[PDB]
Amino acid sequence: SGPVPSRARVYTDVNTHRPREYWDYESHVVEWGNQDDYQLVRKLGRGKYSEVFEAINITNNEKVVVKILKPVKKKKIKREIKILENLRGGPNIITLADIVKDPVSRTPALVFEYVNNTDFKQLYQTLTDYDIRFYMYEILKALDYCHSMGIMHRDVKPHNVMIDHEHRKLRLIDWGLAEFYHPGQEYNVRVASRYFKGPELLVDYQMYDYSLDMWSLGCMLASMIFRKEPFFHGHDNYDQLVRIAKVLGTEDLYDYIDKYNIELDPRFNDILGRHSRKRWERFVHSENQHLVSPEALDFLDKLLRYDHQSRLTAREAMEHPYFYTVVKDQARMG
Ligand SMILES: O=C1C=C2C[C@]3(O)COc4c(ccc(O)c4O)C3=C2C=C1O
């Protein structure tokens, strides 16, 4: 017998009641801009399926970021483009400013707004309790928005959250693994960075939903308030579930698997062993305690749950008392 089917408990049918053209990205016709508007300045990063450059728009001398998409299935390129356009103008969603191509070689490239990112491996060291709450709330705005628009990000991690700290400016980037949610659809579990993979991915439960992103966010939260980056550090996908089991415990893991009738690789049960559930307080020490509060642990504890159906929605998260001080301070008359 197979696994129990599942569906999202929020935003379940958003693509169902939207026009075909909204989610049918294969039929999207790209509106191409002008490649000669942009000059490459320096290479920023080497993706495995792209390269990213700082660049200037020479029509207004504004910095931008250009991502060149070498070979790759056109269908993947169209998915990212349709998702970026669907989401543009959404809170803290990176803005796709242009789409261009070599008119001769046909090689496509995405142009994004420039964000003067703080290093991250450095930034988290200097963040205050208030700073983390503020930026968590901003990330949640992005996730609630893209989930409300029927899209799963599927690659939430600190590298995909650009933060211009001196402008209190946050953008969620890298929508290259993002996908439209359709209830009942069996998805590829080969998404997210190892450290931020939800348990559903790690046990090959394919019928997942937006709640995958909330696990990844939980992992980020833990790493920030406990000053341990990344928080769950497995040496591979199997080990990664072991690192989670050693904190959340094996009993709730086995209840999860049992609830969904999931069927585990035989050798999993040998390396999972048996582990009690650990109190979050066990990770609090002199050096990170100023970032930790009981509201923070209650909040974290409601994100990091095996059962994807059990995790907070972004909307519920935003209502948590952890964010009380940032919500008062954000009600802006402008
Ligand atoms: O799939 C991707 C991938 C990236 C990687 C990357 O190109 C890196 O660097 C960026 C950026 C966006 C804005 C920005 O300011 C910046 O520095 C990125 C993306 C957006 C996407 O949808």
Swiss-Prot record:
PTM: Phosphorylation does not directly affect casein kinase 2 activity, but may contribute to its regulation by forming binding sites for interacting proteins and/or targeting it to different compartments.
The protein's Enzyme Commission number: 2.7.11.1
Presence of keyword Kinase: yes
Protein activity control: Constitutively active protein kinase whose activity is not directly affected by phosphorylation. Seems to be regulated by level of expression and localization.
Subcellular location: Nucleus
Record keywords: Apoptosis, ATP-binding, Biological rhythms, Cell cycle, Disease variant, Intellectual disability, Kinase, Nucleotide-binding, Nucleus, Phosphoprotein, Serine/threonine-protein kinase, Transcription, Transcription regulation, Transferase, Wnt signaling pathway
Record-linked PROSITE patterns: PROTEIN_KINASE_ATP, PROTEIN_KINASE_DOM, PROTEIN_KINASE_ST
Swiss-Prot/TrEMBL GO biological process terms: apoptotic process; chaperone-mediated protein folding; DNA damage response; double-strand break repair; negative regulation of apoptotic signaling pathway; negative regulation of double-strand break repair via homologous recombination; negative regulation of proteasomal ubiquitin-dependent protein catabolic process; negative regulation of signal transduction by p53 class mediator
Enzyme class: transferase
Catalytic activity: L-seryl-[protein] + ATP = O-phospho-L-seryl-[protein] + ADP + H(+); L-threonyl-[protein] + ATP = O-phospho-L-threonyl-[protein] + ADP + H(+)
Known tissue expression: Expressed in gastric carcinoma tissue and the expression gradually increases with the progression of the carcinoma (at protein level).
Active site feature: 155
Superkingdom, natural source: Eukaryota
UniProt cross-references to Gene3D superfamilies, sorted A to Z: Phosphorylase Kinase, domain 1, Transferase(Phosphotransferase) domain 1
Gene Ontology MF terms: ATP binding; Hsp90 protein binding; identical protein binding; kinase activity; protein serine kinase activity; protein serine/threonine kinase activity
Pathology noted in the entry: Okur-Chung neurodevelopmental syndrome: An autosomal dominant neurodevelopmental disorder characterized by developmental delay, intellectual disability, behavioral problems, hypotonia, speech problems, microcephaly, pachygyria and variable dysmorphic features.
PANTHER family: CASEIN KINASE II SUBUNIT ALPHA, CASEIN KINASE II SUBUNIT ALPHA-RELATED
Miscellaneous note of the record: Can use both ATP and GTP as phosphoryl donors. Phosphorylation by casein kinase 2 has been estimated to represent up to one quarter of the eukaryotic phosphoproteome. Casein kinase 2 has been found to be increased at protein level and up-regulated at the level of enzyme activity in the majority of cancers. However, elevated levels of casein kinase 2 are present in certain normal organs such as brain and testes.
Protein purpose: Catalytic subunit of a constitutively active serine/threonine-protein kinase complex that phosphorylates a large number of substrates containing acidic residues C-terminal to the phosphorylated serine or threonine. Regulates numerous cellular processes, such as cell cycle progression, apoptosis and transcription, as well as viral infection. May act as a regulatory node which integrates and coordinates numerous signals leading to an appropriate cellular response.
Entry similarity comment: Belongs to the protein kinase superfamily. Ser/Thr protein kinase family. CK2 subfamily.
Entry protein name: Casein kinase II subunit alpha
Organism: Homo sapiens (Human)
